[PDB]
Amino acid sequence: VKNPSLICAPVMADSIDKMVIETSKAHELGADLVEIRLDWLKDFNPLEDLKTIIKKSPLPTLFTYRPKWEGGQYEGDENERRDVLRLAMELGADYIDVELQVASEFIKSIDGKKPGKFKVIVSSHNYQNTPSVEDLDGLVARIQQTGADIVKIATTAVDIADVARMFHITSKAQVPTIGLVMGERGLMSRILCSKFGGYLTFGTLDSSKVSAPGQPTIKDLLDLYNFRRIGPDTKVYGIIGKPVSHSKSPIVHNQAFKSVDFNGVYVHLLVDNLVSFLQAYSSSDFAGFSCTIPHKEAALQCCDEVDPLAKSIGAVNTILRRKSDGKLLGYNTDCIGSISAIEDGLTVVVIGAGGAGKALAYGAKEKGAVVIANRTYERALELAEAIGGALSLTDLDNYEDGMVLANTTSMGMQPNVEETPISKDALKHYALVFDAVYTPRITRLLREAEESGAITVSGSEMFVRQAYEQFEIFTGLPAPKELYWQIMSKYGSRENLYFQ
Ligand SMILES: NC(=O)c1ccc[n+]([C@@H]2O[C@H](COP(=O)([O-])OP(=O)(O)OC[C@H]3O[C@H](n4cnc5c(N)ncnc54)[C@H](OP(=O)(O)O)[C@@H]3O)[C@@H](O)[C@H]2O)c1
Ligand SMILES: O=C(O)C1C=C(O)[C@@H](O)[C@H](O)C1
């Protein structure tokens, strides 16, 4: 509905002087407005303090004095609380957020007293779930009926499929609407506002100044997700996984899309049930997906058509939605990525028999030489016979001297930084050691291997390679290889990052 979504920065410092400094930082960062959370102020002298904030703030102001009964911090007289909000309006506030429960009474009290450049936001918070479209419509209607200028609804995501309902509300409600879904599983609702008609989204000054679960930083909205470039026609892509917060796919693909001016946006997709997810987002708005742990196998089954390579491997890490009919096509870029990465580094001992293990095993055979060691023996066995090559995860420790080791399990992946699939005593037997885990870049395994005298190949080499191949599949444009290497070096080098 109407204009692109604004970016509002929550201001919660416990003193007036600190809030003033925060409004300045919000400006520096690129926010469009700030939400002053008055209920977080330790000491508060209404007239004096409100006067100061309004005078010194470089950005439009939105005042909120949230009470404990609506998830806020304020306790005490209700009339006093309301007097403060009215006082804010009188002094020049650009907006005030008033709770639905008392919005009727409030809006009546200011009838014919509203300044020219002043709008009243009426909000509702649901800390349990995201109601049906039927119930959301009734909520919108109730809020409109109070005389609100802007409708604000915040729900909670029990499952990622819940977000689709909020997009329907922001996209079709004929009234300015701020619609957000809280929780990691609802993050997408905070990023794609400009495509689905949302009036505003909240971005934080920093990762520690969060006012509600799931809020991203202003910096990431602008520079990582390319917020300003998102519009009604932008195609949506994402990394499907569980967990998925460690993924850097959104960093590299959004940079690349921007560089070649491709109208697309890439986000994190925390998925519990793959089947329900694909069914919930089958529209042409969702054009493609990357798939990581542990949905690579399930992805294969959900595809209408599977590339010969993906089929022989038994796993899919790339899904494309054909604009023609609207069916899903499956591909596998993991094989080429891992094999090419290893060869460049130079009997392959593959640790793990899941999606990545299957691809690396297959490809290793295609090149000539393969042993599969897995926690769950049966899987390693099944795989070994599938490509003519099994080893018990325990026998791997005491298992030639110029062999190559390739870990494809999630052992060592953040935050399990001290896990390693094998004893460093067996490393001296390998010439090269590869690790698919790329977060962190240097796992305990690669570290002890480097100390074992062997040559190492980090998962980042495999990551960039499989990623530029996905770009080509998604956009139909030649893989900009050199570009992806540059993007990863410049923007994807920081460790311990979680997007949630
Ligand atoms: N950088 C890249 O390009 C790239 C590409 C692909 C995958 N990866 C990484 O490699 C990992 C696996 O992805 P995936 O799709 O193949 O997941 P799967 O879920 O497809 O593979 C998971 C594997 O690790 C599991 N596992 C969990 N804890 C284990 C433990 N403590 N000891 C032994 N195995 C354990 C499974 O063991 P069981 O079979 O016994 O259950 C299994 O072999 C992820 O961390 C991912 O980030 C990186
Ligand atoms: O974003 C990630 O972590 C990814 C990880 C691997 O599983 C790739 O196969 C995916 O395509 C992307």
Secondary structure: elements and pairs:
Layout: E1 6-11, H1 16-29, E2 33-37, H2 46-56, E3 61-64, H3 78-91, E4 95-99, H4 100-109, E5 119-125, H5 133-144, E6 150-156, H6 163-172, E7 177-182, H7 188-191, E8 200-202, H8 218-224, E9 235-241, H9 249-259, E10 264-270, H10 274-280, E11 286-291, H11 296-302, E12 305-306, H12 308-313, E13 318-321, E14 328-331, H13 334-345, E15 348-351, H14 355-367, E16 371-374, H15 377-386, E17 391-392, E18 403-407, E19 430-435, H16 444-450, E20 455-457, H17 459-475, H18 481-491
3-dehydroshikimate (DHK) is lined by residues 239, 247, 249, 290, 292, 317, 334, 466, 470.
Keywords: Amino-acid biosynthesis, Aromatic amino acid biosynthesis, Chloroplast, Lyase, Multifunctional enzyme, NADP, Oxidoreductase, Plastid, Transit peptide
Subcellular location: Plastid, Chloroplast
Active site: 125, 152, 296, 334
Please sum up the structure shown.
GO terms for molecular function: 3-dehydroquinate dehydratase activity; NADP binding; shikimate 3-dehydrogenase (NADP+) activity. The protein is 37% helix and 19% strand.
CATH topology of the largest domain: TIM Barrel
CATH class of the largest domain: Alpha Beta
Radius of gyration from the alpha-carbon trace, in angstroms: 26 Å
Q: Strands across the major sheet, in which order? A: 7-6-5-4-3-2-1-8
Q: β content, as a range?
A: 15-25%
Q: Main beta sheet: strand number and arrangement?
A: 8 strands, parallel
Q: In the residues, how many domains can be counted? A: 3
Q: What's the helical proportion of residues?
A: 25-40%
Shape: elongated
What's the β-strand tally?
A: 20
The CATH homologous superfamily name of the largest domain equals: Aldolase class I
Catalogue the ligands.
Answer: NADP nicotinamide-adenine-dinucleotide phosphate, 3-dehydroshikimate
Kindly, what is the distance between the CA atoms of the first and last residues, rounded to a whole number of angstroms?
A: 27 Å
Q: Based on the coordinates given, report the CATH architecture of the largest domain.
A: Alpha-Beta Barrel
Number of helices: 18
Q: Class by helix and strand content?
A: alpha/beta
GO molecular function, one term: NADP binding
Region (3-dehydroquinate dehydratase): 7-224
Subunit structure: Monomer.
Active site: 125 (proton acceptor), 152 (schiff-base intermediate with substrate), 296 (for shikimate dehydrogenase activity), 334 (for shikimate dehydrogenase activity)
